[PDB]
């Protein structure tokens, strides 16, 4: 038997919410509230209600005003439900409420102009429908507040002054709203703040030098705003800074000396800014740096020779910059290097690059695309990359043959050599990589037949090959042609298992044994010299989604068995020698005429047509 006041308040609360939780089915009868689901009391369990924690209960409805009658409640947690409409005023007057988590519901409207919650520690409204002015006036009566989480709301208007009066504020999360203007100078009074997310708003102006006043910062997320100007060179004042996220802004200048000297930074992401000049870090000074993303900037000059002196730097993305010259010779010592993305950086001497980089024994994923333009792909067979998983060197217009030194990387998972000038036959050892699920050799000069060993590729047949996906900190992008919008893959295993051989000079038949690859999603043979019959055994490729045979010289008929490919949504035989009926119904009726054009193929009952 509990207090009549709590009993009442709790009965009204649940009157507005469905479903009734497990222990609340007795609610209108039962007098023992403290043993209801998600309720806690003082004394032992036997006093006033101090905690109402109903998070992730699938609760649907509105909040009762009589929630404000629980005088002793220190913790109110309704997060991860379907609760909607307004927050009752009476909730903002609870004298004992330490912890308020309303995050992730459908709540809307606005916060009252007058709030008195003297005991409040953490305040979490994130992931809701709240708009309007930021409730910075909460600082007046909650002098103890540690945590304000407002992220993922509709707050627009100025980033409003007044948070600086929450003197003990530690976490402040404003991310993913519509805020405009610069950071109120008010904010720079919070000397105990260790987390500032402002990311994904419309904020702009320079990032003030007054930021040196927030000396407790650990994580600074400024990403995805309109900031510009130089990054202020204050970072010796922020000795605890571990994560700095500035990506997708208008920052200019280089990396400030103080940031380039910070011993505490784990992670620096400045990608997609307006940054420029020589790239200078003092790697003797940055002993915590494990991850560096400078992509889509204008850094120029040579690649900094001292980079391997960051003994912890695992992840490096320098892509889409203005460098020139070769990979420094010191990169032989980059012992920590795992993921190295150099795409589109104007690098020279792929020969030196590969001969140096083979000495980095932790290298797993390497992206060299759009460098070394017109160079000759090194065939030199002392090259050995032992732990290599992902190798992308594409659209470099490279010359030579398929390099056999590659055959010794047994871990290899994804290989993209496409859009080069490579020539000669595709060698048998390409079928020997057991972990390879993706290979793009397309748009080269390759000749000869298709090696039969592609039919016994292990990751494309059985399910008994199992390996760990590489985990670089950057996404990968995929372009079909020069004017196509790109596709994004955050993880390597997001790529469909793929054999892409199109636009080469390959000849001979399509092996019946391709019916062995049960796990292949994409088979692209288009724009080759291939001939013979389309094998009926292809109906055995059970995971097949896209089959492109177009622009070859293939003869005979489309085998009916192909209609047993359950997942095939994308098919073309156009520009071949084929004849007869296109198989009716099922899967093939969904393909457009263009899939069969420039053949002698006709729809059923239409033969001959032309």
């Amino acid at each position: 038997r509990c207090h009549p006041h709590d009993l009442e308040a709790l009965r009204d609360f649940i009157a507005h919410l469905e479903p009734k939780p497990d222990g609340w089915i007795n609610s209108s009868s039962s007098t023992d509230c403290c043993n209801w689901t998600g309720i806690t009391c003082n004394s032992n369990n036997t006093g006033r209600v101090i905690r109402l924690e109903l998070g992730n209960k699938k609760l649907s409805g509105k909040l009762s005003e009589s929630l404000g009658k629980l005088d002793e409640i220190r913790v109110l947690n309704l997060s991860r439900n379907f609760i909607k409409d307004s927050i009752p005023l009476s909730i903002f007057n609870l004298k004992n409420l330490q912890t308020l988590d309303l995050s992730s519901n459908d709540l809307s409207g606005g916060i009252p102009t007058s709030i008195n919650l003297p005991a409040l520690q953490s305040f979490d409204l994130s992931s809701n429908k709240f708009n309007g002015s930021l409730p910075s006036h909460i600082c007046h009566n909650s002098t103890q507040i540690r945590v304000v989480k407002l992220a993922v709301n509709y707050f627009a208007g100025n980033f409003t002054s007044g948070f600086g009066k929450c003197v003990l504020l530690e976490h402040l999360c404003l991310g993913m709203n519509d805020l405009t203007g610069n950071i109120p100078e008010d904010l720079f009074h919070l000397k105990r703040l260790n987390l500032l997310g402002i990311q994904e708003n419309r904020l702009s102006g320079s990032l003030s030098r007054e930021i040196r006043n927030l000396s407790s910062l650990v994580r600074l997320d400024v990403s995805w705003n309109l900031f510009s100007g130089e990054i202020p060179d204050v970072f010796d004042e922020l000795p605890q800074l571990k994560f700095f996220l500035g990506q997708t802004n208008g920052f200019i200048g280089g990396i400030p000396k103080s940031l380039a000297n910070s011993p505490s930074l784990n992670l620096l992401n400045l990608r997609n800014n307006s940054l420029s000049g020589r790239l200078m870090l003092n790697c003797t000074a940055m002993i915590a740096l494990n991850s560096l993303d400078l992509g889509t900037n204008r850094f120029n000059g040579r690649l900094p020779e001292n980079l391997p002196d960051c003994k912890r730097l695992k992840n490096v993305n320098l892509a889409r910059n203005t460098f020139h010259g070769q990979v420094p010779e010191s990169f032989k010592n980059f012992e920590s290097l795992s993921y190295f993305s150099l795409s589109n950086s104007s690098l020279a001497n792929i020969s030196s690059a590969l001969g140096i980089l083979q000495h980095c024994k932790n290298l797993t994923t390497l992206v060299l695309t759009l460098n070394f333009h017109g160079e000759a792909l090194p065939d030199d067979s002392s090259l050995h990359f032992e732990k290599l998983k992902v190798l992308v060197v594409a659209n470099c217009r490279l010359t030579g043959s398929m390099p056999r030194w590659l055959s010794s990387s047994n871990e290899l998972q994804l290989l993209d050599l496409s859009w080069n000038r490579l020539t000669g036959a595709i060698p048998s050892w390409i079928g020997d990589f057991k972990a390879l699920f993706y290979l793009d050799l397309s748009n080269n000069s390759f000749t000869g037949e298709i090696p039969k060993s592609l039919t016994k590729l292990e990751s494309l047949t059985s399910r008994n090959i199992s390996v760990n996906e590489p985990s670089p900190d950057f996404p990968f992008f995929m372009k079909r042609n020069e004017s196509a919008r790109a596709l994004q893959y955050n993880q390597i295993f997001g790529f469909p298992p793929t054999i892409e051989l199109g636009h080469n000079n390959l000849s001979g038949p399509i092996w019946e044994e391709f019916g062995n690859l049960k796990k292949l999603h994409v088979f692209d043979l288009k724009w080759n010299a291939l001939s013979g019959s389309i094998p009926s055994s292809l109906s055995g490729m059970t995971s097949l989604e896209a089959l492109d045979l177009s622009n070859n010289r293939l003869s005979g008929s489309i085998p009916v068995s192909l209609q047993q490919l359950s997942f095939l949504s994308k098919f073309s035989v156009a520009y071949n020698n084929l004849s007869g009926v296109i198989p009716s119904g099922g899967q093939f009726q969904t393909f457009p005429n263009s899939s069969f054009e420039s053949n002698h193929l006709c729809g059923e009952h239409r033969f001959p047509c032309s």
């Binding site: 992509g295 892509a319 992206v367 992308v392 659209n395 950057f474 990968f476």
Partner: peptide
Amino acid sequence: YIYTQ
């Protein structure tokens, strides 16, 4: 072709 940025 695959690229990175």
